């Protein structure tokens, strides 16, 4: 029973982490996973991040709850300090201790300052780590994650399309594969089921999944062995506005034709 964030990982079993998440966030859902890192030398900061199973209501409120508990030298300064994670990584909730950032540090310093800017990108490495790691840690956890924070990661490829591919691997969409609202199939899972001549990634853009699903012709293609991605997210339309291609395979609308016949021509 000590300050768990400054404690060494060897003593800190899973019990310690799963309890401490509920304690620090004032939340009572479980963490899917966590990333405890101790860093020293130049920047003496000890980070302890958690991935929520469920999205709090204040994840999409005008009053903010996304972010970490800011500590400086074991001393709590601020709560919900999101200036350690960009708005596209807003889901990460936990705490971070710094010996670099001042003790009188404000929310304004957290956003603007270059040392804290380097702190924020250093933690972005842990976010990418936890995300892909979570998908292979337990695919059920990442399924739960996306059904809560799926709109959040779609701010990513719409921001920077240069490294959109790193986020595109992580992105989950719905499909004709299954008539369920659970967004299971990634761009990974699409490429895995791609047929001969299917050089394009097929999408259907919809205001609601039920509206997409109400269409009979979905089963026509699944009967033939083709999968069409049913996209129902409002933000998705702005996400694919930048995400034009993944894995060398360019994207295709339902209202357009592709080269499937061209190979068999």
């Amino acid at each position: 029973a000590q300050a768990l964030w400054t404690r060494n990982k060897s003593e800190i079993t899973d019990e310690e982490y799963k309890e401490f998440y509920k304690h620090i966030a004032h939340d009572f859902n479980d963490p899917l996973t966590w990333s405890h890192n101790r860093v020293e030398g130049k920047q003496e900061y000890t980070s302890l991040l958690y991935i929520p199973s469920q999205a709090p209501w204040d994840m999409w409120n005008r009053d903010h709850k996304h972010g970490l508990k800011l500590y400086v030298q074991r001393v709590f300064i601020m709560d919900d300090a999101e200036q350690f994670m960009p708005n596209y990584l807003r889901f990460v909730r936990g705490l971070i201790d710094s010996s670099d950032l001042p003790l009188n540090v404000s929310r304004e310093i957290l956003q603007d300052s270059t040392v804290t800017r380097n702190l924020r990108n250093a933690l972005t490495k842990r976010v990418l780590q936890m995300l892909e790691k979570l998908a292979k840690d337990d695919a059920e956890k990442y399924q739960t994650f996306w059904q809560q924070f799926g709109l959040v990661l779609k701010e990513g490829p719409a921001e920077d399309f240069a490294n959109q591919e790193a986020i595109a691997k992580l992105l989950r969409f719905a499909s004709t594969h299954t008539d369920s609202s659970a967004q299971t199939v990634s761009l990974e899972d699409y490429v895995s089921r791609m047929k001969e001549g299917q050089e394009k990634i097929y999408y259907i853009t919809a205001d609601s999944y039920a509206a997409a699903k109400s269409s009979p012709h979905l089963e026509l293609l699944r009967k033939k062995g083709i999968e069409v991605l049913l996209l129902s997210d409002r933000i998705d339309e702005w996400m694919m506005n930048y995400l034009t291609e993944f894995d060398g395979k360019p994207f295709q609308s339902v209202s357009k034709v592709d080269e499937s016949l061209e190979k068999l021509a």
């Binding site: 990982k9 899973d14 966590w34 490495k125 840690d137 790193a166 999408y203 033939k224 339309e237 209202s255």
Partner: protein
């Protein structure tokens, strides 16, 4: 081939997949290239550790 592929499900005529939105985002995404061996600490998985072994039952769900 028609104006669209054999999939006639929520079509119109033609479209550049989907587009048009207000730039609400600011700037920062994931790193690409440098697999930095120095930042690690949280090594391996914390679900079934690796393939499940010895310890792994139900404790770390």
């Amino acid at each position: 081939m028609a104006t669209s592929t054999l999939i006639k499900a929520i079509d119109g005529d033609t479209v550049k997949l989907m587009y048009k939105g207000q730039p609400m985002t600011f700037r920062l995404l994931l790193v690409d290239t440098p697999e930095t061996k120095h930042p690690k600490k949280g090594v391996e998985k914390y679900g079934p550790e690796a393939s499940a072994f010895t310890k792994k039952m139900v404790e770390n769900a």
